[model samples]
Target: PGSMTVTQSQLELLIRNAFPEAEITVTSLVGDNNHYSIKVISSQFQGKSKLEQHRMIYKVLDGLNIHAIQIQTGCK
Candidate 1:
């Protein structure tokens, strides 16, 4: 795990357990989870090859903590 913690969730029914009223903030993503964002190119991404750069960020599509190869971009 990286030094900067990551907490993201994307279960519609799971969220509804709390905000069934559809009344929640941070209620967000384009892939269906809402995060305002961090604009830093993350110095890690800066020197990495394009593929290495975005690897783990893309894994969220499959959900958290990958099974195979994993990238760790800890605090810089």
Candidate 2:
């Protein structure tokens, strides 16, 4: 579009929608909204390996404006 605009809260929602019971936290890197550190916790990942868990999370991030994303995961 005109200018890619994705907010911190909106980015959290995308991940949350993928895992309904997940707890998510996002932090901007270098004060830019595009780069982020994301953490997600959910029991859904209890039996899954890290690759499987991470794959599920990535599916929800379709075609969004994100420059860099680093993810941390946990089980809840």
Candidate 3:
């Protein structure tokens, strides 16, 4: 777990809701709600590229006005 201005509970809820079976790790880049780096491992990512994986995460947050996000993903 990493520290962030936002509650871990909120992030956990969002991720779990969108990726129930995915294992996700979130790190706060600047301790602000606007900046974050996330690593997600999921079977859904089996054949996806780095960009495609990030795109999937973004789709999960689809209408929320988030400021910045950096994602690294892989299959496990």
Q: Per-prediction TM-score, please? A: 0.25, 0.52, 0.53
Which candidate has the top score in lDDT? Answer: 3
Superposition-based RMSD of candidate 3 using all C-alpha atoms, in angstroms? 5.0
Q: Tell me the tens digit of each residue's lDDT in model 3 across 1-76.
A: 5655556666666667787987878766665567576766667887987667657757766666444656666733
Can you list the residue pairs that collide in candidate 3? Answer: none
Which regions of candidate 3 deviate over 4 angstroms?
Answer: 1-6, 28-34, 64-68
The order by descending TM-score is 3, 2, 1
Q: What is the C-alpha RMSD of each candidate to the true structure, in Å?
A: 14.0, 7.2, 5.0
Residue range 1-76, candidate 2, lDDT tens digits:
7646656767578668977998887655686556567787777777888677667656545456333456767733
Once superposed on the true structure, which residue ranges of model 1 sit more than 4 Å away at CA? 1-40, 59-76
Compared with the true structure, all predictions reach lDDT values of 0.40, 0.67, 0.68
- What is the per-residue lDDT of model 1 for residues 3-56, given as tens digits with 9 covering 90 to 100? 354353343334346335432233223685543432222343455664664564
Q: Which prediction has the highest TM-score against the true structure? A: 3
State which candidate, 1 or 2, has the greater lDDT: 2
Worst 10 residues of 2 by lDDT: 60-69
